[PDB]
Design an enzyme around this catalytic site. Sequence first.
Site, short mmCIF file in Angstrom:
data_model
loop_
_atom_site.label_atom_id
_atom_site.label_comp_id
_atom_site.label_asym_id
_atom_site.label_seq_id
_atom_site.Cartn_x
_atom_site.Cartn_y
_atom_site.Cartn_z
N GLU A 100 0.87 -1.18 0.00
CA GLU A 100 0.00 0.00 0.00
C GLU A 100 0.90 1.23 0.00
OE1 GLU A 100 -4.22 1.22 0.25
OE2 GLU A 100 -2.53 1.32 -1.18
N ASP A 101 0.39 2.33 -0.54
CA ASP A 101 1.11 3.61 -0.59
C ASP A 101 1.13 4.23 0.82
OD1 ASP A 101 -1.73 4.14 -0.93
OD2 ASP A 101 -1.34 5.83 -2.32
N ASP A 110 -3.21 5.22 7.09
CA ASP A 110 -3.55 6.31 8.05
C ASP A 110 -4.54 5.75 9.08
OD1 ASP A 110 -5.77 6.67 6.10
OD2 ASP A 110 -4.52 8.25 5.16
N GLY A 165 -6.12 2.96 8.93
CA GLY A 165 -5.97 1.49 9.03
C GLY A 165 -7.27 0.70 8.76
N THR A 188 -9.30 0.26 5.88
CA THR A 188 -9.26 -0.59 4.66
C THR A 188 -8.30 -1.76 4.83
OG1 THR A 188 -9.85 1.25 3.34
CG2 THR A 188 -8.93 -0.60 2.13
N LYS A 213 1.13 7.12 8.81
CA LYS A 213 0.65 8.20 9.70
C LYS A 213 0.13 7.54 10.96
CE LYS A 213 -0.77 11.63 6.27
NZ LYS A 213 -1.91 12.49 5.84
N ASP A 227 -3.09 10.83 -4.92
CA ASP A 227 -3.75 11.89 -5.71
C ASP A 227 -4.26 12.98 -4.77
OD1 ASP A 227 -5.97 9.89 -4.87
OD2 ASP A 227 -7.09 11.56 -5.66
#
Lengths: 169, 166
Positions: A92-93, A96, A98, A100, A124, A152
């Site tokens: 994953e990129d 934050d 958590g 998903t 994060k 994005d």
Amino acid sequence: MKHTVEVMIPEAEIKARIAELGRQITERYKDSGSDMVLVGLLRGSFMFMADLCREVQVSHEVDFMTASSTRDVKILKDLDEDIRGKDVLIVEDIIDSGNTLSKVREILSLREPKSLAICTLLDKPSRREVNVPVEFIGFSIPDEFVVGYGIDYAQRYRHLPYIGKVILL
Amino acid sequence: KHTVEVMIPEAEIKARIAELGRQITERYKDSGSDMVLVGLLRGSFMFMADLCREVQVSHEVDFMTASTRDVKILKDLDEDIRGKDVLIVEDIIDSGNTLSKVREILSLREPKSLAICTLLDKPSRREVNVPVEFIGFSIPDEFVVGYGIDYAQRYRHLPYIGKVIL
């Protein structure tokens, strides 16, 4: 919004960090023997996955899921390949909340992979709502407005080769 | 039972992707319409990561998964393309059958423009005359792996284009 983008993590620092994640991933899994798959969550992970898989010197498959983004986590696109009895690394990129990653790990766990682990480029930890184990982390950052390297803002900046900070004007 | 030989080294791919990116930039920089690069999964993820970073025009990145058989949408685009410049991004064109059918599907959505960029082209394998605006390498009909392309699920993560010797 009127805004600007500044460089926060340059291309060169990202690449040096990915080469170190790739040695650590290689070390943990090289003796396993079992098949391995790297699973990216789309669209965010596509750039991270491309750079990361090239640094992982263990024979593996690359596959992708799309999960929906207090509403249920839904599979918009499942894996093409079976993971039963395989070493699986979710890529994953950013983690934050958590929420998903947590629900995606539970779904895949049902398929009885040999092992299940997560690699994120960005963490994060201050944004965490649900605890989930993350074995490999590129960078720990405060809750900054970040873009680039698959992240994005308003269908902009996914293609930046660095992590940028958005300044609202 | 097989080996993999290097066919196109990592450094040649990188230099060619930088030129493709300069050409795509020159083509689209004056448009002032939204732009999206659309990759065909799975084989295009690595080419897309490298190519989109050489395209010096603001764009969106989206993906689609397409299948003697109909071309079916297993995963459609997340974004609308009506009125946008669209570049289809593909690892390899051989027969031209899938790309031809994918271009006709997306054409129905009335993009401002539609084009293809392929890393690899096997013009010896063409069965249908699909227009391709940007090509990294025209190659012989070798058994190609690496850089997103698999042999039985293996070798997708190779940073070079290899060929399989049986």
